[PDB]
């Protein structure tokens, strides 16, 4: 039932407004946002820090490539946007490092 290629609608709730774009299912959220000209926080780009943190509001992600968040944090909706792939349409609140 699965497509050979897919993308998903990403809605980012950023400090300067909501923005939306299609993200390939094999491109990380951060990278796809940047390709669309959206400036999001980051540092390591390796899944091992707090800089790119966001909160997942709607939908589902694959965060196998992240390491810094613990299992409880993942269960509570934390996202490292540099290391997350969408597996559905998603809504993510960005710029959330301060809440960790
Ligand atoms: S920029 Fe460090 S985990 Fe994403």
Residue numbers in the entry: -4 to 95
What did the authors write?
The noncanonical amino acid, para‐cyanophenylalanine (CNF), when incorporated into metalloproteins, functions as an infrared spectroscopic probe for the redox state of iron‐sulfur clusters, offering a strategy for determining electron occupancy in the electron transport chains of complex metalloenzymes. In conclusion, we have incorporated the noncanonical amino acid, CNF, into two FeS proteins, and in each case observed a small, reproducible shift (<2 cm−1) in the nitrile stretching band of CNF following cluster reduction and re‐oxidation, which is consistent with an electric field effect from proximity to the cluster(s) in different redox states. We also obtained high‐resolution crystal structures of CNF‐labeled proteins in both the oxidized and reduced states, demonstrating that site‐specific placement of CNF caused minimal structural perturbation, and giving a precise location for the CNF side chain in each protein. In the multicenter hydrogenase, DdHydAB, the nitrile group of CNF is 12 and 13 Å from the [4Fe–4S] proximal cluster and the [4Fe–4S]H subcluster of the H‐cluster, respectively; the fact that spectroscopic changes are observed at this distance confirm that this functional group has long‐range sensitivity to redox changes. These investigations lay the foundation for employing site‐specifically incorporated CNF to probe the redox state of FeS cluster‐containing proteins by IR spectroscopy.
Spinach FdI was selected as the first model system because of its small size and the accessible redox change in its [2Fe‐2S] cluster. Recombinant FdI was purified by GST‐affinity chromatography followed by cleavage of the GST tag, and further enriched by anion‐exchange and size‐exclusion chromatography for crystallization. The reduction potential of wild‐type (WT)‐FdI determined by cyclic voltammetry, −0.40 V versus the standard hydrogen electrode (SHE) (all potentials are subsequently quoted vs SHE), and the UV–visible spectra for air‐oxidized and dithionite‐reduced FdI were consistent with previous reports.
